[PDB]
Short mmCIF file of C-alpha atoms and ligand atoms in Angstrom, two decimals:
data_model
loop_
_atom_site.label_atom_id
_atom_site.label_comp_id
_atom_site.label_asym_id
_atom_site.label_seq_id
_atom_site.Cartn_x
_atom_site.Cartn_y
_atom_site.Cartn_z
CA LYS I 7 136.40 173.58 88.19
CA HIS I 8 133.38 174.81 89.61
CA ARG I 9 130.79 175.69 87.04
CA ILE I 10 127.61 173.06 86.27
CA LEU I 11 126.48 172.87 82.76
CA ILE I 12 122.81 171.49 82.11
CA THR I 13 122.02 170.44 78.62
CA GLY I 14 118.35 170.86 78.14
CA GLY I 15 118.20 173.35 80.82
CA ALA I 16 115.51 175.48 79.33
CA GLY I 17 113.09 172.45 79.59
CA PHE I 18 111.09 170.89 82.17
CA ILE I 19 113.31 168.84 84.25
CA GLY I 20 116.62 170.98 83.17
CA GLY I 21 115.11 174.13 83.97
CA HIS I 22 113.80 173.34 87.46
CA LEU I 23 117.25 171.82 88.20
CA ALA I 24 118.94 174.93 86.65
CA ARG I 25 116.50 177.47 89.08
CA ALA I 26 117.07 175.30 91.67
CA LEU I 27 121.19 175.38 91.70
CA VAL I 28 121.04 178.96 90.53
CA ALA I 29 119.02 179.52 94.00
CA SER I 30 121.76 177.69 95.82
CA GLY I 31 124.61 180.03 94.69
CA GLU I 32 125.75 177.92 91.91
CA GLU I 33 127.42 179.07 89.00
CA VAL I 34 125.15 177.74 86.19
CA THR I 35 125.32 177.20 82.35
CA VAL I 36 122.15 175.94 80.65
CA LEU I 37 122.58 174.56 76.72
CA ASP I 38 119.57 174.22 75.06
CA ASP I 39 118.78 174.93 71.31
CA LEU I 40 115.21 175.48 72.04
CA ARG I 41 114.03 172.85 69.51
CA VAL I 42 110.65 172.62 71.46
CA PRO I 43 109.49 175.88 72.79
CA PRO I 44 109.99 175.86 76.69
CA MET I 45 106.81 176.35 78.95
CA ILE I 46 108.72 179.03 81.21
CA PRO I 47 111.01 181.60 79.63
CA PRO I 48 114.44 180.38 80.14
CA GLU I 49 115.27 183.87 82.24
CA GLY I 50 116.92 183.51 85.47
CA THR I 51 118.84 180.13 85.01
CA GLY I 52 122.58 181.40 84.24
CA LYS I 53 124.60 182.04 80.96
CA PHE I 54 122.92 180.50 78.19
CA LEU I 55 124.20 178.55 75.37
CA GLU I 56 121.56 178.47 72.62
CA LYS I 57 122.86 175.57 70.59
CA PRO I 58 122.33 172.01 70.32
CA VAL I 59 124.70 169.59 72.36
CA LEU I 60 126.48 168.42 69.31
CA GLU I 61 128.03 172.12 68.83
CA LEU I 62 129.49 171.95 72.45
CA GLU I 63 132.99 172.95 72.22
CA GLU I 64 136.25 172.44 74.88
CA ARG I 65 135.82 176.06 75.77
CA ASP I 66 132.20 175.72 77.14
CA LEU I 67 133.64 173.34 79.53
CA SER I 68 136.93 174.61 80.84
CA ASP I 69 136.01 175.70 84.23
CA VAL I 70 132.75 172.88 84.50
CA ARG I 71 133.00 170.26 87.09
CA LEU I 72 129.54 168.86 86.75
CA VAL I 73 127.58 168.39 83.64
CA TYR I 74 123.71 167.02 84.09
CA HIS I 75 122.80 165.70 80.30
CA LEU I 76 119.20 166.10 79.92
CA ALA I 77 118.87 167.24 76.38
CA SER I 78 116.71 164.83 74.63
CA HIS I 79 113.90 164.10 71.74
CA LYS I 80 112.10 162.50 74.56
CA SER I 81 108.52 161.59 72.96
CA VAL I 82 107.74 158.12 72.84
CA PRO I 83 104.62 157.60 70.23
CA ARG I 84 106.34 160.33 68.05
CA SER I 85 109.79 158.40 67.65
CA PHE I 86 107.58 155.54 65.63
CA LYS I 87 107.46 158.42 63.21
CA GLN I 88 110.71 160.38 63.14
CA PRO I 89 112.91 157.35 64.16
CA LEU I 90 116.05 158.56 62.28
CA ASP I 91 115.68 162.02 64.54
CA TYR I 92 115.81 159.90 67.59
CA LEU I 93 119.55 158.99 66.76
CA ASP I 94 120.63 162.50 67.43
CA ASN I 95 120.37 161.41 71.17
CA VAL I 96 123.26 159.04 70.54
CA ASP I 97 125.47 161.68 68.50
CA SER I 98 124.94 163.87 71.32
CA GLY I 99 125.88 161.85 74.17
CA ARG I 100 128.83 160.41 72.01
CA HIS I 101 129.79 163.90 71.25
CA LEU I 102 129.39 165.53 74.99
CA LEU I 103 131.29 162.63 76.58
CA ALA I 104 134.32 162.68 74.20
CA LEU I 105 134.54 166.34 75.02
CA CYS I 106 134.17 165.97 78.79
CA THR I 107 136.95 163.36 78.75
CA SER I 108 138.96 165.38 76.59
CA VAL I 109 138.67 168.57 78.87
CA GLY I 110 139.04 166.31 82.41
CA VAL I 111 135.31 167.18 83.25
CA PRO I 112 135.06 165.52 86.70
CA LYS I 113 131.25 164.11 86.53
CA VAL I 114 128.70 163.56 84.20
CA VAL I 115 125.16 162.83 85.13
CA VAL I 116 123.32 161.19 82.10
CA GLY I 117 119.71 161.57 81.81
CA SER I 118 118.01 158.12 80.73
CA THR I 119 114.57 156.61 81.18
CA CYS I 120 112.71 153.59 82.22
CA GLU I 121 111.85 152.82 79.07
CA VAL I 122 114.86 151.45 78.15
CA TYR I 123 113.50 148.57 80.09
CA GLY I 124 110.32 147.78 77.86
CA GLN I 125 107.73 145.83 79.78
CA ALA I 126 110.15 144.47 82.45
CA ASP I 127 109.62 140.91 83.82
CA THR I 128 110.72 141.94 87.27
CA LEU I 129 108.33 144.69 89.28
CA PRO I 130 109.71 146.44 91.04
CA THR I 131 112.50 147.14 88.56
CA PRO I 132 116.08 146.73 89.47
CA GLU I 133 118.89 148.38 87.74
CA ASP I 134 120.33 145.27 86.89
CA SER I 135 117.14 144.23 84.56
CA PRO I 136 117.85 143.82 80.59
CA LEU I 137 117.01 146.28 78.51
CA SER I 138 113.79 145.75 75.98
CA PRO I 139 113.04 149.04 74.03
CA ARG I 140 109.96 148.80 72.48
CA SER I 141 110.29 152.30 70.47
CA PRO I 142 112.89 153.81 68.37
CA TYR I 143 113.17 156.67 71.46
CA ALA I 144 113.60 154.15 74.04
CA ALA I 145 115.97 152.31 71.51
CA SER I 146 117.99 155.52 71.39
CA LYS I 147 118.23 155.78 74.90
CA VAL I 148 119.60 152.63 75.05
CA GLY I 149 122.42 153.57 72.58
CA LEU I 150 122.89 156.56 74.53
CA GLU I 151 123.40 154.18 77.65
CA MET I 152 125.80 152.10 75.90
CA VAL I 153 128.30 155.06 74.97
CA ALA I 154 127.90 156.29 78.81
CA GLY I 155 128.55 152.59 79.79
CA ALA I 156 132.17 152.65 77.69
CA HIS I 157 132.88 155.71 79.46
CA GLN I 158 132.27 153.95 82.97
CA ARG I 159 134.69 151.55 81.87
CA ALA I 160 137.57 153.43 80.96
CA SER I 161 139.78 154.77 83.75
CA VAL I 162 139.78 158.41 82.92
CA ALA I 163 137.28 161.39 83.65
CA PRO I 164 134.50 161.70 83.78
CA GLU I 165 132.76 159.85 86.54
CA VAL I 166 129.60 158.87 84.93
CA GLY I 167 126.41 158.10 86.42
CA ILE I 168 123.47 157.14 84.53
CA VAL I 169 119.73 158.21 85.90
CA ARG I 170 116.60 156.15 84.64
CA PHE I 171 113.73 158.38 85.19
CA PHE I 172 110.43 156.89 85.70
CA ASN I 173 107.43 159.42 85.00
CA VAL I 174 108.13 162.96 86.12
CA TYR I 175 105.65 165.65 86.28
CA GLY I 176 104.55 168.93 87.59
CA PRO I 177 104.23 172.60 86.59
CA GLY I 178 106.36 173.68 83.53
CA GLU I 179 106.09 170.29 81.98
CA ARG I 180 104.72 170.60 78.04
CA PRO I 181 101.63 169.16 77.41
CA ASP I 182 102.20 166.01 75.15
CA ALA I 183 102.91 163.96 78.77
CA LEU I 184 100.07 162.80 80.75
CA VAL I 185 99.22 164.87 83.81
CA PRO I 186 99.88 167.99 81.45
CA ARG I 187 97.66 166.64 78.92
CA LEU I 188 94.89 166.10 81.02
CA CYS I 189 95.33 169.54 82.93
CA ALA I 190 95.40 171.30 79.40
CA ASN I 191 92.21 169.31 78.25
CA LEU I 192 90.29 169.74 81.26
CA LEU I 193 90.69 173.30 81.07
CA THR I 194 90.02 174.03 77.11
CA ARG I 195 87.83 171.15 76.38
CA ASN I 196 86.40 169.71 79.63
CA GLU I 197 87.60 166.18 78.50
CA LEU I 198 90.37 163.66 79.64
CA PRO I 199 92.13 161.78 76.89
CA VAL I 200 92.53 157.85 77.61
CA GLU I 201 94.56 156.10 75.26
CA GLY I 202 93.30 152.47 75.34
CA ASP I 203 91.88 151.10 78.10
CA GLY I 204 93.46 153.28 80.76
CA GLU I 205 94.48 150.17 82.64
CA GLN I 206 98.45 150.71 81.72
CA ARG I 207 100.47 151.82 84.65
CA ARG I 208 103.12 154.28 85.58
CA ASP I 209 105.48 155.16 88.43
CA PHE I 210 105.24 159.00 88.92
CA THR I 211 107.55 161.34 90.80
CA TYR I 212 106.68 165.08 91.60
CA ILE I 213 109.39 167.48 89.68
CA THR I 214 110.37 168.61 93.21
CA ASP I 215 111.48 165.72 94.53
CA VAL I 216 113.25 164.68 91.69
CA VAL I 217 115.28 167.97 91.55
CA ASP I 218 115.83 167.20 95.00
CA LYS I 219 117.56 163.78 94.15
CA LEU I 220 119.52 165.42 91.22
CA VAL I 221 120.91 167.78 93.33
CA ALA I 222 121.94 165.28 95.85
CA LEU I 223 123.94 163.71 93.05
CA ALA I 224 126.16 166.80 92.72
CA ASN I 225 128.25 166.24 95.86
CA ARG I 226 128.27 162.52 95.78
CA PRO I 227 130.06 159.35 94.24
CA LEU I 228 127.47 158.67 91.18
CA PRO I 229 126.20 155.24 91.01
CA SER I 230 126.69 153.76 87.02
CA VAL I 231 122.67 153.32 87.06
CA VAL I 232 119.91 154.45 89.23
CA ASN I 233 116.30 154.35 89.17
CA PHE I 234 114.52 157.50 90.18
CA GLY I 235 111.07 156.57 90.89
CA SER I 236 108.75 156.48 93.49
CA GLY I 237 108.56 152.64 93.45
CA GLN I 238 104.76 152.49 93.65
CA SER I 239 102.47 152.59 89.97
CA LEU I 240 99.10 154.01 89.27
CA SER I 241 97.35 153.11 86.55
CA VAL I 242 96.10 155.86 84.13
CA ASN I 243 92.39 155.42 85.19
CA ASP I 244 93.68 156.04 88.82
CA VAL I 245 95.15 159.48 87.47
CA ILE I 246 92.12 160.23 85.28
CA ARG I 247 89.53 159.34 88.87
CA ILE I 248 91.78 161.89 90.59
CA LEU I 249 90.85 164.70 88.35
CA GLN I 250 87.27 163.87 88.17
CA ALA I 251 87.17 164.31 91.91
CA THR I 252 87.82 167.86 90.86
CA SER I 253 85.97 168.03 87.88
CA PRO I 254 82.80 165.67 87.79
CA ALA I 255 81.55 167.20 84.53
CA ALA I 256 84.74 165.98 82.99
CA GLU I 257 84.05 163.57 79.89
CA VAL I 258 86.73 161.14 79.63
CA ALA I 259 87.40 160.91 75.81
CA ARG I 260 88.61 157.38 74.76
CA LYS I 261 91.50 157.14 72.44
CA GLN I 262 93.36 154.83 70.16
CA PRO I 263 95.67 152.66 72.24
CA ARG I 264 99.66 153.08 71.82
CA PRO I 265 101.57 150.83 69.93
CA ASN I 266 103.79 148.58 71.53
CA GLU I 267 102.17 149.80 74.80
CA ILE I 268 103.92 149.07 78.15
CA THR I 269 101.32 147.83 80.81
CA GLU I 270 103.58 148.85 83.97
CA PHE I 271 106.33 150.75 84.78
CA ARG I 272 107.62 150.69 88.64
CA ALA I 273 110.88 151.36 89.90
CA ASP I 274 112.97 149.17 92.62
CA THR I 275 114.02 152.25 94.61
CA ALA I 276 116.82 149.98 97.10
CA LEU I 277 119.71 151.38 95.17
CA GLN I 278 118.23 155.05 94.85
CA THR I 279 117.55 155.14 98.94
CA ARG I 280 121.08 153.83 99.90
CA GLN I 281 122.85 156.02 97.59
CA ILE I 282 121.13 159.10 98.38
CA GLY I 283 118.97 158.06 101.24
CA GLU I 284 115.58 159.03 101.35
CA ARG I 285 113.75 162.22 103.00
CA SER I 286 110.51 162.10 104.85
CA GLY I 287 108.49 164.32 102.77
CA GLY I 288 108.13 164.01 99.00
CA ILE I 289 104.81 164.86 97.28
CA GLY I 290 101.76 162.44 96.89
CA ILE I 291 100.09 162.13 93.84
CA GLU I 292 96.89 164.02 94.83
CA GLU I 293 98.74 166.93 95.85
CA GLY I 294 101.23 166.98 92.72
CA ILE I 295 98.16 166.66 90.68
CA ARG I 296 96.42 169.56 92.53
CA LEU I 297 99.52 171.68 92.31
CA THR I 298 99.83 171.05 88.64
CA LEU I 299 96.17 171.77 87.76
CA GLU I 300 96.96 175.18 89.73
CA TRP I 301 99.84 175.77 87.68
CA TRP I 302 97.71 175.45 84.62
CA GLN I 303 94.70 177.33 85.76
CA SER I 304 97.30 180.37 86.49
CA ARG I 305 98.03 180.14 82.30
CA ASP I 306 96.49 182.22 79.88
CA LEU I 307 93.68 180.10 77.88
CA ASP I 308 95.33 180.35 74.90
CA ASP I 309 98.22 178.49 76.07
N1 NAD B 401 109.75 164.19 81.99
C1 NAD B 401 109.77 162.66 82.26
O1 NAD B 401 108.41 162.56 82.57
C2 NAD B 401 111.19 162.18 81.71
C3 NAD B 401 111.08 160.73 82.06
C4 NAD B 401 112.31 159.87 81.47
C5 NAD B 401 112.67 160.57 81.30
N2 NAD B 401 113.07 161.69 80.94
C6 NAD B 401 114.25 162.07 80.57
O2 NAD B 401 114.60 163.56 81.29
C7 NAD B 401 115.25 164.68 80.21
C8 NAD B 401 114.77 165.73 80.49
O3 NAD B 401 113.08 165.57 79.85
P1 NAD B 401 112.05 166.83 79.90
O4 NAD B 401 110.82 166.13 80.47
O5 NAD B 401 112.72 168.00 80.57
O6 NAD B 401 112.10 167.45 78.73
P2 NAD B 401 111.99 168.83 78.02
O7 NAD B 401 111.68 168.49 76.29
O8 NAD B 401 111.04 169.84 78.73
O9 NAD B 401 113.38 169.33 78.02
C9 NAD B 401 114.55 168.95 76.91
C10 NAD B 401 115.23 169.98 76.36
O10 NAD B 401 116.15 169.76 75.85
C11 NAD B 401 116.31 170.70 74.47
N3 NAD B 401 116.73 169.89 73.70
C12 NAD B 401 116.23 168.41 73.19
N4 NAD B 401 117.39 168.06 72.36
C13 NAD B 401 118.49 168.92 72.45
C14 NAD B 401 119.97 169.02 71.71
N5 NAD B 401 120.44 167.56 71.30
N6 NAD B 401 120.49 170.03 72.07
C15 NAD B 401 120.26 170.98 72.42
N7 NAD B 401 118.91 171.17 73.33
C16 NAD B 401 117.96 169.83 72.90
C17 NAD B 401 114.75 171.03 74.21
O11 NAD B 401 114.76 171.89 73.40
C18 NAD B 401 114.05 171.10 75.79
O12 NAD B 401 114.26 172.09 76.22
C19 NAD B 401 115.55 163.73 78.86
O13 NAD B 401 116.96 162.95 78.71
C20 NAD B 401 114.33 163.02 78.92
O14 NAD B 401 114.50 161.74 78.04
C21 NAD B 401 112.06 162.82 81.32
C1 UD1 B 402 106.25 163.12 76.70
C2 UD1 B 402 107.23 162.57 78.09
O1 UD1 B 402 107.31 163.17 79.12
N1 UD1 B 402 107.63 161.43 77.92
C3 UD1 B 402 108.19 160.69 79.12
C4 UD1 B 402 107.00 159.68 79.96
O2 UD1 B 402 106.73 158.75 78.93
P1 UD1 B 402 105.41 157.93 78.32
O3 UD1 B 402 104.71 157.49 77.12
O4 UD1 B 402 104.95 157.15 79.97
O5 UD1 B 402 104.50 159.41 79.39
P2 UD1 B 402 103.13 159.82 78.62
O6 UD1 B 402 102.55 160.89 79.81
O7 UD1 B 402 103.20 160.34 77.23
O8 UD1 B 402 102.03 158.72 78.68
C5 UD1 B 402 101.80 157.85 79.83
C6 UD1 B 402 100.87 157.18 79.74
O9 UD1 B 402 99.53 157.96 79.48
C7 UD1 B 402 99.00 157.72 78.25
N2 UD1 B 402 98.16 158.76 78.00
C8 UD1 B 402 99.04 159.86 77.63
C9 UD1 B 402 98.47 161.21 77.70
C10 UD1 B 402 97.00 161.57 77.54
O10 UD1 B 402 96.43 162.38 77.14
N3 UD1 B 402 96.26 159.90 78.06
C11 UD1 B 402 96.62 159.03 77.67
O11 UD1 B 402 95.83 157.98 78.37
C12 UD1 B 402 99.96 157.10 77.39
O12 UD1 B 402 99.41 156.35 76.51
C13 UD1 B 402 100.88 156.25 78.17
O13 UD1 B 402 100.30 154.82 78.43
O14 UD1 B 402 108.13 158.81 80.50
C14 UD1 B 402 108.98 158.22 80.33
C15 UD1 B 402 109.49 157.29 81.37
O15 UD1 B 402 108.58 156.04 81.32
C16 UD1 B 402 110.19 158.98 79.33
O16 UD1 B 402 111.02 158.09 78.74
C17 UD1 B 402 109.37 159.84 78.50
O17 UD1 B 402 110.52 160.88 77.99
#
């Protein structure tokens, strides 16, 4: 048992993770059914299984020591329109963890999200805070966590760790998320869309930092649940500001607010710091946005 399998491994976090592990000398399998088109063609990320997580089989796992489960439907606003489709997130986790148990896979990292906290009543938000999902997507991640929790309580393989990602951004991320949306809109429309008043706040972490942290989990005991966030929040307006510092001509296009909007996500990082320590560096928001925008600038206008 030596291979790493990454579900969602053609997508934004999973593709970067796959590339870093292959760059490190690891034997990597990516599993991804390409149900959303990847920004970056999958080439170079290892053996590729182009199927749903639900079609994973025993033999796909037979030499696998570690799984990163990152395959998800991940859109908060769209989950209000296709709520039943989001049940696939629960089905897939139930299937994956069942198969890992029957085969004896040693470790699984399960991707979850700060959205399971809803609007938390404790800021910064610690991992023991209760669950208050405000969308069908968030509800589906709560379901996925419940499945993983049962495996955590069971005294059988895999060791299962839940990672609650806060907002991750960077090159390669599709433009339905804030930073890339703003970039893609700034470039094709000279517009910076703001949904609602823009006072709502998110905790942003740059993709390379998140990948470094995920890799640090490959060779340490997994915490049952850990926040991956920066520990600081910024308003949508703060991000807008940073971009207009770059493009003063940009027009802010007011959009309609989201339903059940969350005013602030902010990670408590004490557990993260303890389990995986912290490195000096890390990409600040100014630089991260710039690197993201530059990446978008190297994309052909049609995009
Ligand atoms: N990006 C963030 O800002 C962020 C924040 C919090 C949580 N997360 C979580 O991180 C993970 C990865 O997010 P991302 O931004 O890379 O998304 P992504 O859309 O870029 O990648 C997910 C990949 O999974 C594939 N996929 C989805 N469902 C699948 C299924 N059941 N079977 C096979 N392939 C499937 C998609 O085709 C895609 O390439 C998800 O678990 C997501 O919920 C991401
Ligand atoms: C698409 C995506 O990656 N979603 C992830 C993102 O959700 P989340 O919904 O926070 O991410 P978004 O980037 O979609 O939205 C962030 C904020 O910016 C606003 N907005 C967005 C786009 C825009 O062009 N203008 C604008 O003002 C939104 O209303 C929201 O208030 O982080 C979550 C953790 O918190 C994850 O669970 C989600 O999977």
